């Protein structure tokens, strides 16, 4: 068996959702921000936001909504986790003591159902009569909000429309009514139903179906003065309400897909709209009052306000202040002005909240020679792309290098006092036949520049027609100085060539240190790339020289230096190249038993291969024979996102389901079959998507640092910006910390009453297993935050083992010391 | 000649790697040195010498040289390790069963989460599986181990049934005592949970119905670790075993012993309301408690869902590709 | 695709055994003894008639490729029965076959099994499988005797007498090389033909074509009387050589 420990070094920073309301008091204006597993509660001021409370939940926050049922003084909070843990929460404050109350809770998972393409949707009736949930295709789940439903019991209503895009409860209806866009073979349509709690079924809806734009994305329930709904698409915005129909199709929005919406005026007069290019619009409802005394919708107008970060959620607060919640870049507070500035913009940034964004890649480097180590991450996407340099100093200090294009891979080259960074920028097919970039960025702002002139694929004869307005990616290798972080050089790769892998190393007997890049020729027609390059660059005297190029028949997904040789994975193949005295790559040996060799790692003559669907394989280079040997494979199938070697026997993997697992050689030489089977001894639901594992630590090492019980250090970066740490334990230390977890879980009160053991259980759509071989260090480190009565309750009847004394009782002061040392690894 | 099996050496294949761990040996991917064809080699280890050549392999050699069907895996030949020269007693070299290499297995594709099935994809998949099963059943052979892992799939959309290690002949006229515990619990029929021991080819049909539902849900339908727990889950959806729906249930050994918590009513049509009507009717008939009322393989092929499916159009599933490695930023 | 398992009578003059100096009479005796050893061992163990026949067919085929002087017959027989049990799903443990083989064989005969009987048998399984070219599925005259008899309608008592007498001749033909000369379908017809002659029955009357005097042609196409007479002659030769007489 294997024993490991996992802690958070940086909590998730990306904003997954945000709502406003009156949650902490019926009087205050609240802003609740949801980061993965984290809920942040703020109070709105005239200066900005006053933080008041933050809680963690044992689940990914999928739904977050505020509502106030009749009889309540203030808003209540509904949250549903991605594992279908539902709960209703209340804020309660007694002087200085703030706590969160679980009013109702339960798990709403169905035994039989197909998870929907557009994900979990949760909405609440305007009269707060019921909670609507769209969890599975063809089913609509209703949790009625009666006071007796403390277990959140619910029923399903058969829904004929299997493929639903979005749904909202409508305002101004005699009965609870849902309006939703759905897709069938005839296109997309908008349709309404009435929801009857008494009959527990749908009844005919207030207005008929209308056919809508093929890419109708979002539904807006317009408030009582207007009523009805607005439908946002790629090209058009339409309003629907019985006999009334409007459509505005301004050319302004066709340029970029609109992803978020918010209501500015409670009466529905004004809405905010944001798009993937960071543009912020105002949607205006022009009123016309008739002599009847009725109010109708006369027309719709869209007005461009300015530019924000690419926002997952918008929420207007008060006055001119808007909170911009960003998942791909830094979040913001911005002020909307009535008068535009001299550039024509109505938007001026107030504050910027650090978001480590998607961490696509990262490396640890001793820039200042401190023996400490700093973490340089490839963070963000598109305009929010950045390099973030992170050091420990009690908070983490983070420096941001704006790139305005997507960073893909990073690798440090000490000889050149610089970093190599792969990046891609979006250009659009223009009337010249070529393409034009939407904005300047790192690859166009380099001091010196170069473009590949390779003739390898120049023969072509394969047609790829271009239509004006289509997007394409342009990939580059950036040379970036380690002190100024100034782009010294940008090399642009071939048209339709993607840069997938990057290493900096010396090869063979060649004393020169090279940047080596593996690429793939990506054409829309192809399912899997069938052409690619391995390119050897030398950065010398401010310019990048092409030293050699090797053509391959696939995508070079991963490369890693192997004892003076170059180890590269091309599609299914894993290949080892030698670097000749003629400065060309020469193939030594191949291994082909893969589906897609996405990831590679090396220790000694051993290789860890990560596959798209076949989990991880352990290869070995046989120098006596000049070839590879298969040592052991993990035959449990998993979809890999990243891998890492912990030691000669233990191997770490990350799943696309937000799970971690550890494989080990079965170390039983009885049969060859036992050795060739990698046994999954560690299983752990992380809750984050791991892109990059990286050996190293951020802690200061003066070497006077006490030797911690934990041995080894692997950092990992995630899509939501979370940075974590994996380290190993002895059997003695694992048992102590595991037994302590079971005690802590009985003592600590969970938000939503979610069982901790459930949360960390390995989870795919198909299976659920109890966690094994992993200590939730974030749980262990919470021992220091529980009250003294609880601490002593935890240590009761707790014994140590395999120590200086075989049996030794623990005190609350003893464990406080142990955990405090465990907090010093990050 | 092509028929003189057991003599050709495994030297004739370049071994690529081990695709899986089997029952009587490890399964290896390999390339034929002469033709270039990719094969899968099932290694047979007789070195144990407990009972010699494993019967599981004998069944697969005996049966798969009889069965010829596009939806039934074909054994190409049997090859051997370099045999010790004229000293058969010391010779402990193994034998390898040569099969056509198939790109994927359904379990691998489903477990990885890298396959999406449309209705038309499910039609092409089910029609091939039922045709393969009908061929086998028409030849009076039982598979007895139908699982997603035993359904191999090429990217073209061709399906083939594979593990015939537990397959045996069925005699209608004469009931024969068989092995009660044959199919894996998740795909095991209710009759065998109660221990019929004299089972019909309908056991294989129930398994294929479980697959039909799993293709629509992407999650296995009846997942339990204990035989009684399985009966409960099946009972909740298909209804509790009772004499009205299964007149002969009272003779089954464990009927009184193994009882569900309640006498649940059948809810299959309600819980699978999202499944198309043509398919839902097939599921109701395939997942019928009474094996004598459970539909046949032929009857599934003469169903509204599958009868008009044309195998010229195989409809490949939406399978693993290159952008599946990259995660979408928006 | 599939191998040829049928030889001509003339070809039996050139088996490995014959060419190592064994005369035709001796090989015939060694085959009867081995077949009957297989029959008796498996009968004591309670084995189905198909299981006995399959082992006997393996045995007969084996010694078309090997010599009786280099492969002791009783070891081969035990090995064939051991494999036959697994092929026909009537498995037995090798130790039980040895136990029964010891009960039925004298001390000299059991000396063939050497110092470790089980090992001598289990080791041979490899050569047996390669020799029979891994073609394990075998059909026997029994199923055709019954398939064809069911299509006869008439006096139940006369037809059952026909079947049992024919069934006995099938059991007796397992000691001969007829298994190596003629497909089982033909054997089943020949034994029906023989029993009819002995019981003075006219089988055509029981067929759907009562005026089709060559009644067997509807069961087995392209079989001349020449063949059925050759087979009948060979079966009755066994009875005449011994002291046993036709069952009647
Ligand atoms: C017995 C274990 C497997 C599990 O799939 N069953 C199986 N899989 C086949 N191919 C699918 C396949 N490609 C793979 C490539 C890799 Cl790298 C890995 Cl790790 C597993 C793989 N699995 C196949 N082809 C002919 N047979 C035949 C029957 C023998 C097959 N049997």
Residue numbers in the entry:
A (entry chain A): 1 to 393, 708 to 1140
B (entry chain B): 715 to 1044
C (entry chain C): 20 to 267
Task: Give the authors' words.
Recently, several unexpectedly diverse compounds were reported to deplete cyclin K by linking CDK12–cyclin K to the DDB1–CUL4–RBX1 E3 ligase. Here, to investigate how chemically dissimilar small molecules trigger cyclin K degradation, we evaluated 91 candidate degraders in structural, biophysical and cellular studies and reveal all compounds acquire glue activity via simultaneous CDK12 binding and engagement of DDB1 interfacial residues, in particular Arg928. Crystallographic dissection of 28 ternary complexes demonstrated that despite considerable diversity of the molecular glues, the overall complex architecture is highly similar. The low-affinity DDB1–CDK12 interaction primes the complex, while the ligand, through filling the kinase pocket and bridging over to DDB1, drives robust association, offering a rationale for the unusually broad chemical diversity observed.
We also synthesized six compounds that are hybrids of SR-4835 and CR8 (DS18 (65), DS17 (66), DS19, DS22 (67), DS21 (68) and DS20 (69)), yielding a series bearing all possible combination of the R1-3 substituents. SR-4835, DS17 and DS18 were CDK12 selective, while CR8 and DS19 were not, linking potent pleiotropic CDK inhibition to the co-existence of phenylpyridine and isopropyl substituents on the purine scaffold. Hence, the modification of the gluing moiety from phenylpyridine to dichlorobenzimidazole (CR8 versus DS17, DS19 versus DS18) is sufficient to increase the gluing potency and reduce off-target CDK inhibitory effects of CR8. The ten best-performing degraders were DS73, DS71, DS72, DS17, DS18, SR-4835, WX3, CR8, 21195 and DS28, a list that overlaps remarkably well (8/10) with our in vitro data. Performing the assay at lower protein concentrations for selected compounds revealed subnanomolar dissociation constants for the top derivatives (for example, DS17) but presented experimental challenges with a limited assay window. Notably, the compound’s Tanimoto similarity to CR8 and its in vitro activity show no clear correlation, with the ten best DDB1–CDK12 molecular glues (DS18, 21195, DS72, DS17, DS19, DS25, DS73, SR-4835, CR8 and DS16) ranging from CR8-like (1.0) to distinct (0.33), further supporting that diverse chemistries facilitate the formation of this complex. To better dissect the cellular responses, we examined the extent and depth of cellular CDK12, CDK13 and cyclin K degradation by mass spectrometry using quantitative label-free proteomics on MDA-MB-231 cells treated with representative compounds. These experiments identified three of the six compounds tested (DS17, 21195 and SR-4835) to be more effective at depleting cyclin K than CR8 at 1 µM concentration.
